[PDB]
Amino acid sequence: PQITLWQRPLVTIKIGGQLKEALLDTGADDTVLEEMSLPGRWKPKMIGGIGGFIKVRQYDQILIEICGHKAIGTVLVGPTPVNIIGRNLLTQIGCTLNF
Amino acid sequence: PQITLWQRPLVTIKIGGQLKEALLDTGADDTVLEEMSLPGRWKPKMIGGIGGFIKVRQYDQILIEICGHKAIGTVLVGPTPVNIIGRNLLTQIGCTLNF
Ligand SMILES: NC(=O)C[C@H]1C[C@@H](C2=CN[C@@](Cc3ccccc3)(C[C@H](O)[C@H](Cc3ccccc3)NC(=O)O[C@H]3CCOC3)C2=O)c2ccccc21
């Protein structure tokens, strides 16, 4: 589909069998979700944001559906204002910017 | 053009007689640029995300050129780690997300 930007590009994602609202964020290299439970082991990851660098938990090879499109990749979990879908997953679903 | 998301979607912008590199961010409501001088009045504002909040100066009705596309809108100026072109200006150049 084609998404205009007059409002926030919020979509429904599915992870761990549950639906959540998330933002398609081209300015984010990675995907960071609000506190939740994910399977497997995690590793430390430092990410830079508008207000500084913070520590988050990194889970790899996680199944996540974005607006119906299935993806499997790295998902970070930490104190984020909203669920952020970054470039790592946007590329998996074939998303591009156009103008 | 069609911009891939394999890398950060960076573009050249023209504002206040100077060329700058900026990140096209669908995840940002507004546009925020690193410290620079702009004409006209301004009002203080706080924007927050990963890492916390930063204080910025809000200038309205600012002329900007993004990839040869002219647009006018509010531009925030402050200690942002990178220049960010948000939805308020992305819409004006007809930028959309496609997948
Ligand atoms: N009101 C608003 O729209 C949000 C505020 C804050 C800031 C904001 C928008 N989106 C985000 C997320 C957000 C936060 C609150 C509400 C909606 C979305 C992320 C933004 O794209 C940064 C961009 C970035 C910052 C520093 C370095 C490099 C890129 N990327 C980023 O942190 O990537 C990291 C996290 C995942 O991968 C790594 C962000 O922090 C923002 C920017 C301009 C105007 C207003 C705002």
UniProtKB/TrEMBL annotation, chains A, B:
<dbReference type="GO" id="GO:0006508">
    <property type="term" value="P:proteolysis"/>
</dbReference>
<dbReference type="GO" id="GO:0072494">
    <property type="term" value="C:host multivesicular body"/>
</dbReference>
<feature type="domain" description="Peptidase A2">
    <location>
        <begin position="20"/>
        <end position="89"/>
    </location>
</feature>
<keyword id="KW-0378">Hydrolase</keyword>
<dbReference type="InterPro" id="IPR001969">
    <property type="entry name" value="Aspartic_peptidase_AS"/>
</dbReference>
<dbReference type="InterPro" id="IPR021109">
    <property type="entry name" value="Peptidase_aspartic_dom_sf"/>
</dbReference>
<dbReference type="InterPro" id="IPR001995">
    <property type="entry name" value="Peptidase_A2_cat"/>
</dbReference>
<dbReference type="InterPro" id="IPR034170">
    <property type="entry name" value="Retropepsin-like_cat_dom"/>
</dbReference>
<dbReference type="Pfam" id="PF00077">
    <property type="entry name" value="RVP"/>
</dbReference>
<keyword id="KW-1039">Host endosome</keyword>
<protein>
    <submittedName>
        <fullName>Protease</fullName>
    </submittedName>
</protein>
<keyword id="KW-0645">Protease</keyword>
<dbReference type="GO" id="GO:0004190">
    <property type="term" value="F:aspartic-type endopeptidase activity"/>
</dbReference>
<keyword id="KW-0064">Aspartyl protease</keyword>
<dbReference type="GO" id="GO:0055036">
    <property type="term" value="C:virion membrane"/>
</dbReference>
<dbReference type="InterPro" id="IPR018061">
    <property type="entry name" value="Retropepsins"/>
</dbReference>
